[PDB]
Amino acid sequence: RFLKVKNWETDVVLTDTLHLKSTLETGCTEHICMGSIMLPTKDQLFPLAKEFLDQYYSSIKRFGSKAHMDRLEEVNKEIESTSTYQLKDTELIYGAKHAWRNASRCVGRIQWSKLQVFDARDCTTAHGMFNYICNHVKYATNKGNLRSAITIFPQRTDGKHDFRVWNSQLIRYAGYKQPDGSTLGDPANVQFTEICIQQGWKAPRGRFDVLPLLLQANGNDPELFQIPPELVLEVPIRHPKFDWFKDLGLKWYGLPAVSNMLLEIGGLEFSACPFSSWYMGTEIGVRDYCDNSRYNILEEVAKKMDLDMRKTSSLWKDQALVEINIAVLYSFQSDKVTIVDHHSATESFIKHMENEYRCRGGCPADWVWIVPPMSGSITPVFHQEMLNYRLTPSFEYQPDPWNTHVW
Amino acid sequence: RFLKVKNWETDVVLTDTLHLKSTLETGCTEHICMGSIMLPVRTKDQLFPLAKEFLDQYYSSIKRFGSKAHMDRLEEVNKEIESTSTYQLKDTELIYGAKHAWRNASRCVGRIQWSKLQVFDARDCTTAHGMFNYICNHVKYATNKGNLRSAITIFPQRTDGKHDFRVWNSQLIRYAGYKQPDGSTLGDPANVQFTEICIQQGWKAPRGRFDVLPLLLQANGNDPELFQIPPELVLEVPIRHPKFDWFKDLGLKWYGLPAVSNMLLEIGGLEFSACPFSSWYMGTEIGVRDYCDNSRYNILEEVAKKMDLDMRKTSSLWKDQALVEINIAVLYSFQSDKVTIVDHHSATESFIKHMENEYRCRGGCPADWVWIVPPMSGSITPVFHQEMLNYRLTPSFEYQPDPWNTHVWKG
């Protein structure tokens, strides 16, 4: 069964055979589409393993080879014997790269092949985790010349000895709920901040406090560690034409490092797998700065611009938004910290997507996430149809550890 | 089976029971979501269920479910379908049906207005000329000197599929598109093909960047005929900017009345192949899509130039900066001529209110996130952060193929 996707700006059509290899469910049915919903055993394990191994071996052009069968045989026995198994270094790398390749919500995926993979499966303690993580941050930041990396901690076993990173990103600002009801710093992290504090963190209480790492190894209680400040690259936010802008007091960190996700490879579950790359401007300028439930800076930025804020139809929110995003890309570029604007980013993903249909017969994409949170229809992805299906290896969500942890 | 939708900006949660009454298919499956795919002659036995269902809804809506009136009508329609292999809707039903097809239009952000809709019954129409007159009346009623009113005109339903009434224009009022030999396009590229059909059919084309197209009307399965809409009936807004005096020099204007004409209205199984409906524009439809889409009027570069923006590097956000001004200039021009119009903030805010009310009183409200979210400043409108379930309810507005692709020319 073939499927076609049209680009309504170029009339380009692509045929998707890849969705055929789909496994997981979408949350959608014949009678309902949940495309905008944010979150919709030995015998179990071997099929999963076999499938992965087949992919891998096909990818290296040894499908059916003796090597292939042997490995198949080996893994087989190992699962029967140990009720789990271990991936060869090559497989772990292939698996990680490909989970990224399959991340339908990622516009960055043209880069999927150039990924630095750190094997931290020999890790056993939170302190071990802290050290590994520090190495990742440093390698990835690279003095502002950002590099994509992932660090993979030991896989789950009985589910009672999970490695987990309790932060949602390696580096994020704290959130303090004041008594008057307002919030200081980043409201997104208010709850995590309360857990840190509650666990011993001496909170400075500022609008941009780098949070402590809170690391759980082997199922043990989480432990706090401060990331060497020297390791935390930051960009002060100023506007190329508004000298009053810097006075707003805004900065952001240069390294987005999602840490709360779950990497699945050949049936194996890696519950702690921080990955990092570089920001698209909008993530910060639009979502982090202007979301009503984040830093929410539109009013203030507007005021300083003296815009007509009486009537929404002045598009004062829109005007401010553009400046704010101009100031973010500007600040970063001026400090030579890697960053990409939403136009370049989306243009590349079209190129990527095309190439993926050519060489792979498809490329799963979540339109809702792929399209930037501003200027949607002026980027090429708006006009681009996308089929969304779920391929493994994958990155999955998982519950916040505090909701599930057995203290 | 209940379903919940969260608003990630307010944490409001809503429970959807309404999707249960869903009938049509989504194009989606357990293994694939086509949520971003633009487009994913009946029978006696087919028709009555469709009719019965509709009638049940209607009667429930007036609080006569199971009433003698209800059963009789049920009985009547029944016999009529058996006898005539079709049937006719009471005036009350046609109105209920139309209003509710709008109410179920999952791609419509304007639906808070769904109840206040002027319905024109043009089922007695028989000729293209008849159609032209009806349409002129609609345009005039709806425009209302710039104080826009929502209206729909419903022409005779399909019978054997050989005597369809069709409006060949996609909107009652739209600008022409001429493909020049150098490869460029004059006017609106979206209508180039329709323009060629008009010309080919006798239209004397002015060849300008804003020529109101002739109506091309088909009655009873007959060949289409041309009619010019009285210019005095076609309200237009010259586009200028409240601070850029150079803007008016761009030479831009738009018409004040969006009137989708190429859609198919289905009610109680009946198919109304010609049903122009009209309301008022949301700014972005014009400022963002019609003006800035690359394949429409594509004015970003020029607007940028005049602003002398840094167009060397995309990261100057020159496209973004121009876009905002252009949209400011559209809402401005219209408001200054007192032609109804709504900005994307007000529009999306209202739809949240509407959506909430719909969950309260109706147990749901089908919505297509991809279409509901404005083509600019997405995440600063409330609908971005709003989860939406999309399912298909009837009565509905459906797409249908372009008439020229299917028409059996009589000559």
Ligand code: HEM
């Ligand atoms: C290299 C440049 C990259 C860029 C420009 C980029 C860009 C983005 C953006 C803008 C989002 C939306 C995130 C949000 O709105 O919160 C996203 C999501 C995502 N990206 Fe990428 N990314 C890059 C690299 C990577 C890498 C290295 C990985 C993993 C190896 C990855 C996997 C993902 C995943 C799993 C999501 C969805 C996460 C979630 O649901 O919160 N990306 N990316």
Ligand code: HEM
């Ligand atoms: C009165 C104020 C209204 C507003 C502000 C409004 C707004 C909109 C907008 C912005 C769209 C997106 C259209 C596009 O992107 O091309 C849309 C789509 C749609 N609306 Fe409305 N509308 C209104 C009234 C109506 C009426 C009167 C009807 C029918 C009776 C209707 C039914 C629809 C339908 C069927 C679509 C889908 C069109 C398509 O698929 O191309 N709306 N509406």
Ligand SMILES: C[C@H](O)[C@H](O)[C@H]1CNc2nc(N)[nH]c(=O)c2N1
């Ligand atoms: C309701 C909707 O699913 C939710 O707001 C989504 C919308 N689209 C998005 N797209 C991206 N890239 N990132 C996000 O956090 C969201 N949030």
Ligand SMILES: C[C@H](O)[C@H](O)[C@H]1CNc2nc(N)[nH]c(=O)c2N1
């Ligand atoms: C491919 C994609 O679905 C297509 O560009 C859609 C996306 N969202 C839209 N949303 C609205 N309201 N109107 C449109 O024409 C579109 N175009």
Ligand SMILES: NC(=[NH2+])NCCC[C@H](N)C(=O)O
């Ligand atoms: N480019 C990335 N890898 N982004 C990861 C998620 C970052 C997150 N959206 C933020 O703005 O904080």
Ligand SMILES: NC(=[NH2+])NCCC[C@H](N)C(=O)O
């Ligand atoms: N508000 C409406 N009824 N819009 C109908 C579609 C108009 C279309 N978006 C246009 O720009 O021409």
Ligand SMILES: [Zn+2]
């Ligand atoms: Zn779907």
